[PDB]
Amino acid sequence: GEEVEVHNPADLPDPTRIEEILEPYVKLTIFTPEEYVGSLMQLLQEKRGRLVNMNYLPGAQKRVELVYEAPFAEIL
Amino acid sequence: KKVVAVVKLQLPAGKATPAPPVGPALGQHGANIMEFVKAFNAATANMGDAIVPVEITIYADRSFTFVTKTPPASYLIRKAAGLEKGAHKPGREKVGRITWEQVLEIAKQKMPDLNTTDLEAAARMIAGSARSMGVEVVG
Amino acid sequence: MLMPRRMKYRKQQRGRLKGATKGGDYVAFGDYGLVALEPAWITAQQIEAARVAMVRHFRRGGKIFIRIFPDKPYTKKPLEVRMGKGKGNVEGYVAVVKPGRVMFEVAGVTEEQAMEALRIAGHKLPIKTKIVRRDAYDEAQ
RNA sequence: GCCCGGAUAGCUCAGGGUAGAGCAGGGGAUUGAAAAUCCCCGUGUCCUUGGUUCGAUUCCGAGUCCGGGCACCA
Numbered sequence: 353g354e355e356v357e358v359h360n361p362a363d364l365p366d367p368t369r370i371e372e373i374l375e376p377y378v379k380l381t382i383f384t385p386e387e388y389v390g391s392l393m394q395l396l397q398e399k400r401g402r403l404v405n406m407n408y409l410p411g412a413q414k415r416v417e418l419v420y421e422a423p424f425a426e427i428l
Numbered sequence: 429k430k431v432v433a434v435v436k437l438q439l440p441a442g443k444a445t446p447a448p449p450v451g452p453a454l455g456q457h458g459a460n461i462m463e464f465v466k467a468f469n470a471a472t473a474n475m476g477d478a479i480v481p482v483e484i485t486i487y488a489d490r491s492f493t494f495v496t497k498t499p500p501a502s503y504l505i506r507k508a509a510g511l512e513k514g515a516h517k518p519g520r521e522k523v524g525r526i527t528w529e530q531v532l533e534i535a536k537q538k539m540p541d542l543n544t545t546d547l548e549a550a551a552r553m554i555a556g557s558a559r560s561m562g563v564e565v566v567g
Numbered sequence: 568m569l570m571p572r573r574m575k576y577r578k579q580q581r582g583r584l585k586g587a588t589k590g591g592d593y594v595a596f597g598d599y600g601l602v603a604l605e606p607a608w609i610t611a612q613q614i615e616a617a618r619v620a621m622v623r624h625f626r627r628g629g630k631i632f633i634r635i636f637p638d639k640p641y642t643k644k645p646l647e648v649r650m651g652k653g654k655g656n657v658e659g660y661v662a663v664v665k666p667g668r669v670m671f672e673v674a675g676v677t678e679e680q681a682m683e684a685l686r687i688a689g690h691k692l693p694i695k696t697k698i699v700r701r702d703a704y705d706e707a708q
Numbered sequence: 709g710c711c712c713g714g715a716u717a718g719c720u721c722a723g724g725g726u727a728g729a730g731c732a733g734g735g736g737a738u739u740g741a742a743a744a745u746c747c748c749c750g751u752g753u754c755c756u757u758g759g760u761u762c763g764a765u766u767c768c769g770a771g772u773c774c775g776g777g778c779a780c781c782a
């Protein structure tokens with residue numbers, strides 16, 4: 353089954369019999385103005401966030417909204 | 429109400445949903461996003477699939493207008509003898525092989541794109557995409 | 568790095584470094600060569616560093632001809648030791664190179680590749696050198 | 709850095725025509741059920757990356773590293 357490598361990376365279960373280590377991810381939404389977007393994406397890349405979605409709220413003209421699934425630990 | 433940007437880009441006849449670059453460039457827009465899908469993946473589907481871009485024009489009251497063509501000479505050669513890469517190490521690698529007229533059909537489709545309305549200069553054309561994936565011209 | 572597989576004698580006297588080279592003065596196997604302009608005991612570690620440098624430059628393609636061999640053993644007393652008590656121990660091998668000698672040759676390689684690989688390789692040796700290109704004069708030899 | 713070598717399974721390891729064994733495990737045999745013993749079975753991206761070959765753990769590079777030599781190191 354499953355349980356949590358708690359406040360002790362040392363106190364694992366035996367990585368002998370192991371198949372899935374799970375990070376906490378998070379639904380991460382970024383309201384940038386204009387195409388700082390270019391900067392933003394490079395940042396979220398090395399933070400290992402998957403790009404799921406982006407949407408322009410037009411009007412003038414900057415405003416872009418980015419949605420990301422990213423490992424919770426990679427913020428903090 | 430976005431300006432009149434001249435929309436030269438590089439998209440694919442099939443791979444079509446609002447993941448980038450469908451979004452960033454077509455931000456300055458307001459068009460029916462799933463139309464390069466719809467009309468382009470359907471009306472030019474006889475050839476197969478693959479990459480062809482699209483030339484839209486945005487006008488301020490959210491107006492689209494686009495025309496396109498033919499999957500890339502490196503696709504029309506992937507149906508040929510069964511490839512989906514090149515040959516990694518060509519110049520000597522003769523994986524698939526074609527005849528001087530089994531590579532005369534492939535320009536029946538990409539003919540209206542170069543400047544050669546002669547399917548000799550349009551044969552060695554698509555047969556040049558051969559070498560950079562290694563498929564040969566027999567004897 | 569090169570050393571003889573066996574020797575009649577372990578230690579040998581220093582000798583003089585006089586004269587132009589006796590032979591090996593014409594490009595004999597490749598298209599370009601590096602020739603010595605001054606005499607020297609070129610050590611094996613030097614030869615190895617010159618070889619590798621050109622190799623690295625030919626990462627895909629090329630033949631390297633090393634036409635000098637370090638057969639002369641090099642002797643050195645242990646440090647902080649008074650004069651006497653016999654001749655030092657062999658601590659390495661050198662090749663005696665006199666001016667005019669062709670030390671390295673490259674083939675199978677564009678002119679630019681050849682004169683760049685030989686230029687680096689010169690920078691590894693304790694002597695001034697000259698890069699040369701197989702001549703009718705080599706063919707006549 | 710250097711000379712010798714030495715990185716092959718979760719671990720300790722044997723070794724130019726695709727490499728195994730102990731071991732840990734999981735399961736099984738034995739038992740009333742265990743311990744001990746024994747059987748069975750894997751993912752090896754033969755340490756990483758590039759090249760050499762028709763064929764590389766092997767050969768040529770580079771990278772990081774491990775055990776012994778020198779050397780720096782009140």
Ligand SMILES: [Mg+2]
Pocket residue numbers: 608610
């Ligand atoms: Mg010296």
Ligand SMILES: [Mg+2]
Pocket residue numbers: 641642643
């Ligand atoms: Mg001496």
Ligand SMILES: [Mg+2]
Pocket residue numbers: 649650651
């Ligand atoms: Mg003395």
Ligand SMILES: [Mg+2]
Pocket residue numbers: 642643644654655656
């Ligand atoms: Mg001595």
Ligand SMILES: [Mg+2]
Pocket residue numbers: 689690691692693694695696
């Ligand atoms: Mg010099």
Ligand SMILES: [Mg+2]
Pocket residue numbers: 782
């Ligand atoms: Mg002290």
